[PDB]
Amino acid sequence: SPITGLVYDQRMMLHHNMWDSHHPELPQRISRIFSRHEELRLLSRCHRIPARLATEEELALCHSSKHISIIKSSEHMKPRDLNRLGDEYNSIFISNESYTCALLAAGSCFNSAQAILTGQVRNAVAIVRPPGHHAEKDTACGFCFFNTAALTARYAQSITRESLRVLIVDWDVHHGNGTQHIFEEDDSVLYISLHRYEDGAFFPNSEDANYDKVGLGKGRGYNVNIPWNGGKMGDPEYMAAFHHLVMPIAREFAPELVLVSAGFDAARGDPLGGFQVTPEGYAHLTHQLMSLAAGRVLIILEGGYNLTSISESMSMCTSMLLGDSPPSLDHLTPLKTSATVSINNVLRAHAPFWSSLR
Numbered sequence: 001s002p003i004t005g006l007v008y009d010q011r012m013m014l015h016h017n018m019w020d021s022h023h024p025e026l027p028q029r030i031s032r033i034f035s036r037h038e039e040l041r042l043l044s045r046c047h048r049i050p051a052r053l054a055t056e057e058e059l060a061l062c063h064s065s066k067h068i069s070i071i072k073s074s075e076h077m078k079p080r081d082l083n084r085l086g087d088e089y090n091s092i093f094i095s096n097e098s099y100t101c102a103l104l105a106a107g108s109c110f111n112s113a114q115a116i117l118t119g120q121v122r123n124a125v126a127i128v129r130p131p132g133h134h135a136e137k138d139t140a141c142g143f144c145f146f147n148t149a150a151l152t153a154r155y156a157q158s159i160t161r162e163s164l165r166v167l168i169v170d171w172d173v174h175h176g177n178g179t180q181h182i183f184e185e186d187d188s189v190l191y192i193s194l195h196r197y198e199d200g201a202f203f204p205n206s207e208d209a210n211y212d213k214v215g216l217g218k219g220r221g222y223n224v225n226i227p228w229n230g231g232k233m234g235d236p237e238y239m240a241a242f243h244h245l246v247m248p249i250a251r252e253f254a255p256e257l258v259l260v261s262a263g264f265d266a267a268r269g270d271p272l273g274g275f276q277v278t279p280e281g282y283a284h285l286t287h288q289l290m291s292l293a294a295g296r297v298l299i300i301l302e303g304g305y306n307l308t309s310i311s312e313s314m315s316m317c318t319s320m321l322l323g324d325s326p327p328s329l330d331h332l333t334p335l336k337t338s339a340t341v342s343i344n345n346v347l348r349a350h351a352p353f354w355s356s357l358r
């Protein structure tokens, strides 16, 4: 079924910051990504998957009733009360349409996972906002209300079987604290994150993101953090992390579905990330993941704030999903010594759990 699905809905643009029309998490992130897909004739090659609202019962797969009800209630708030509610969270703005856009983003991803798991398509891309991976069971954080990726893994298990093996690869420049916590005790969902860490000083500013956090109880080994220290990283570092860590661990895990928390704020041009991963870089990461899970890959937009960088990067990913050949990747410099230390720290930490690690 060599078809690639694409899901996008303009209604997700309604979510906005009422006090700063220029806030980085712009409604125009998704519309510019979508337009580039059109221009490059990628959209027309895809099977268009309908967006939908997630239900409250689906939200409850990962989130508490209290958290759901609080975010639901913002739908009817006056502007000053929205400001106050948003200030109760770390790095959140809320509008009357926020709840609905968050529901659309999750339901769009559920329909995509269903299309893949029932064989209607091989793989899919979801152009959605607001993002999800900083969201926790009981709280909103870092522009995220509900954890779209976490929900989707659980949704997928719910329409297949409880023990469906799901891999979540999170290449957003920030650590997905919410995703790690939701599955920390879980051995059916393998969470792998690459992220700027700087010894805990980079958002979300927690030692939860370090390499030594390997999972808990039966989930021991099923949480893989690859923290970057010492400034700018690029294609050389990310390709080396995939070669030595991500792809060997993923092959041993043998996932049946791969979800990508695909933020593009590690891209060159992005002020919030400060890294230099190129669009060709992201193409190669995507292409490697396609060798897993009989090709069952869902790419889900997280962060990424340079409108041109994210449009070109995510388009490049969809092109790989569609079966185009990978672009030339420039002379991969020897790694920064810092990156080498990071990769060796993860290798040492995970040697007890993954026999295939050399």
Ligand SMILES: O=C(NO)c1ccc(CC(=O)N(CCO)c2ccccc2)cc1
Residues within 6 Å of the ligand: 091, 131, 134, 141, 142, 143, 172, 173, 174, 203, 263, 265, 272, 302, 303, 304
């Ligand atoms: O999802 C994200 N990036 O993909 C993301 C999540 C959270 C942030 C916040 C964040 O990182 N910062 C600090 C920037 O140096 C911040 C800025 C202004 C006000 C409050 C905090 C930035 C990005």
Ligand SMILES: [K+]
Residues within 6 Å of the ligand: 170, 171, 172, 173, 174, 175, 176, 193, 194, 195
């Ligand atoms: K990440």
Ligand SMILES: [K+]
Residues within 6 Å of the ligand: 183, 184, 185, 186, 187, 189, 190, 191, 215, 219, 222, 223
């Ligand atoms: K896990």
Ligand SMILES: [Zn+2]
Residues within 6 Å of the ligand: 172, 173, 174, 263, 265, 303, 304
């Ligand atoms: Zn991010």
